[PDB]
């Protein structure tokens, strides 16, 4: 029944939806994205190597 | 129970019933639909329960940081010569240390 | 001097019941936190089972 | 002398305050900000890759 | 005991129906609107103040 807890619900509520979207990846997978780009940097500097000499 | 038996009768006879009406290659499928809504909701809900484990963190975390600065607030008033204010700040302190034992517990 | 023997024991009395309703805020999210696990666990071994015809 | 020494201490309360209101609108528009950005990417991976027709 | 405990269910139900009427978008932008209107409120309090101190 005021501005301060209504700030706290709706503060809650996007860290809730923050939280829900964490969740969300692991439920559909995680990661594909950074085992890719490991190797993309992997191969950016040995490239980077190669191109150079 | 004569009666019962003929109530048997009445579920058997719908069971028969309904057996003409599975058609194969649609309830089948169906079956299939069924599963996959079951499933997405199920997900969905074990991933709300898993954000909580994420919730606790950010509580119990917060709690501690309170807690260290109530701490630092307190050496100031003892050099200054304020005991109720350093008092007052150890008081505030372990109130949030033992809710982030709690939290912990819980985590 | 009465006024204020009444002060501090209405005040002692009401930072005590701060701290019980601070409780209890902090109870319920450890509460809500169950409810919500104990529900996915049994829709777990209803879905991975086959109870019911 | 009498006001001097309390409207000293009402101004420190309105400022207080508004460094509380200020803080609430800063936090306000980050907060619709991420909220948009998780509700959206939610979206994205229930229908993009989600399951369950 | 129980007119009072039906009454937190009913409290309890209405909580939810309005928790669920709340989308943070709109609420949260309509709290910082309260505390703005609040606010000027309070400045025309502290104009008067320093005025009649003037």
Redesign the interface.
């Known amino acids: 029944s005021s501005?301060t807890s209504?700030?706290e619900?709706?503060?809650n509520?996007?860290?809730?939806?923050?939280?829900?979207?964490?969740?969300?990846?692991?439920?559909?997978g995680f990661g594909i994205e950074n085992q890719f780009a490991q190797l993309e940097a992997s191969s950016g500097v040995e490239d980077e190597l190669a191109a150079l000499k | 129970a004569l009666f019962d038996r003929l109530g048997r009768v009445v579920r058997a006879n719908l069971n028969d019933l309904v057996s003409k009406a599975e058609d194969p290659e649609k309830v089948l499928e169906q079956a299939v639909i069924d599963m996959q809504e079951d499933l997405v909701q199920l997900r969905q809900a074990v991933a709300r329960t898993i954000a909580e484990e994420k919730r606790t963190e950010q509580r119990l975390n917060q709690d501690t940081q309170e807690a260290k600065k109530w701490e630092d607030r307190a050496k100031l008033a003892l050099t200054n010569g304020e005991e109720n204010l350093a008092r007052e700040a150890l008081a505030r302190k372990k109130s949030l240390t033992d809710t982030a034992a709690a939290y912990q517990t819980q985590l | 001097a009465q006024q204020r023997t009444m002060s501090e024991n209405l005040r002692r009395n009401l930072a005590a019941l701060e701290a019980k309703i601070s409780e209890a805020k902090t109870k319920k999210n450890m509460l809500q936190a169950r409810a919500k696990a104990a529900k996915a666990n049994a829709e777990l071994q209803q879905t991975l089972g086959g109870l019911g015809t």
Do not use: C, I, N
């Not at chain 1, 996007?14 to 969300?24: C, K, N, R």
């Open positions: 501005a209504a700030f619900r709706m503060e509520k996007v860290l809730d939806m923050e939280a829900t979207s964490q969740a969300a990846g692991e439920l559909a």
